[PDB]
């Protein structure tokens, strides 16, 4: 009976195994754009993805991760609100059963169809596993998806999904360029928070871009054809794998723009 997204093991249940679920800096949150403070000391975000080396794509039973070689400084996030250098390890998405929901963060209570998470770890901690045990260990860049025009740079990901339909399947996934998933503007909001899945560790500086990317109806339909279950178990479509907004508690959201 492990965690998941259903009535009996979904987000309302997580605090039983992972008590920090009710902690002081949980994610996601609703971004109240009128209450977010413009911070003219915030730097432009530096996204340096020119040398990213993707390796593999994996269905883990919750989402699918595109994993990268993070054994060298190749795909790094820095500046913005960050001190130092954070290395890209994987990206994944959260999405809905319908285009009206699917994002984890919301903007003035608006849900988007999906949300992309590019996960990076602080190089001062030497690796991902050590980084998640630190309050400034990860920087996750979050990008909203709306449905409209296709995102050409996403198609390579959509086309490999039928090869990892069920939990525990993986495939070869080399030479994927994550620059193709970025909107034009790097204007962002930022706040201190957590992983949005168990173990829910409070180790994340969240950087959420204001500008969503457009993906087609066909592209997000292919996400919804994935499965939560393993091969040869009853089919449970992989949809609605998002945690809802959590209390802001004692925190400020900063804006990099007016």
Ligand X SMILES: COc1ncnc(NCCc2ccc(S(N)(=O)=O)cc2)c1[N+](=O)[O-]
Indicate the residue among 38 and 130 with the shorter CB distance to ligand X: 130
The CA-based diameter of the chain, rounded to the nearest angstrom, is: 54
**Mask for 138-177, x = binds ligand X (CB under 6 A):** --x-------------------------------------
Known catalytic residue at 62? yes
The Cα 23–Cα 35 span in angstroms is 22
185-214 positions binding ligand X, by CB under 6 A: 195-197, 199, 201
120 is in an annotated binding site: no
Q: Would you give the distance in Å from CA 178 to the centre of its chain?
A: 13
Nearer to Zn ion, 50 or 253 (CB): 253
Nearest to residue 117, comparing CAs of 206, 179, 29? Answer: 206
Q: Which of 126, 129, 168, 247 binds ligand X (CB under 6 A)?
A: 129
Helix (H, G, I), strand (E, B) or coil at 26: coil
Which structure tokens are listed for 22? 């009710």
218/68 Cα distance (integer angstroms)? 26
Query: Using CB under 6 A, which residues numbered 109 to 128 contact ligand X?
Result: 117, 119, 128
User: Distance between CA 54 and CA 171 in Å, rounded?
Assistant: 11
- Tell which one of 117, 120, 167, 210 touches Zn ion (CB under 5 A): 117
Residues that bind ligand X (CB under 6 A): 117, 119, 128-129, 132, 140, 195-197, 199, 201
Question: What is the contact surface with Zn ion in residues (CB under 5 A)?
Answer: 117
């Amino acid at each position: 009976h492990h965690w998941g997204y259903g009535k009996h093991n979904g987000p309302e249940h997580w605090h039983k195994d992972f008590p920090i679920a009710k902690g002081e800096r949980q994610s996601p949150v609703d971004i109240d754009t009128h209450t977010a403070k413009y911070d003219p000391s915030l730097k432009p975000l530096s996204v340096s993805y020119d040398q990213a080396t993707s390796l593999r794509i994996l269905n883990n039973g919750h989402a699918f991760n595109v994993e990268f070689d993070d054994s060298q400084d190749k795909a790094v996030l820095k500046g913005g609100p960050l001190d130092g250098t954070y290395r890209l390890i994987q990206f994944h998405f959260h999405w809905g059963s319908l285009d009206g929901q699917g994002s984890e963060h919301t903007v003035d209570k608006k849900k988007y169809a999906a949300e992309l998470h590019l996960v990076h770890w602080n190089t001062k901690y030497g690796d991902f596993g050590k980084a998640v045990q630190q309050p400034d260990g990860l920087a996750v860049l979050g990008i909203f998806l709306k449905v409209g025009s296709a995102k050409p740079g996403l198609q390579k990901v959509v086309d490999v999904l039928d090869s990892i339909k069920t939990k525990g399947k993986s495939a070869d996934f080399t030479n994927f360029d994550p620059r193709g998933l970025l909107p034009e503007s790097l204007d962002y909001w930022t706040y201190p928070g957590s992983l949005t899945t168990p173990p829910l560790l409070e180790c994340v500086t969240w950087i959420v871009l204001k500008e969503p990317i457009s993906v087609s109806s066909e592209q997000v339909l292919k996400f919804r054809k994935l499965n939560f279950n393993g091969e040869g178990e009853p089919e449970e479509l992989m949809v609605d794998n998002w945690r809802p907004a959590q209390p802001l508690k004692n925190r400020q959201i900063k804006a990099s723009f007016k």
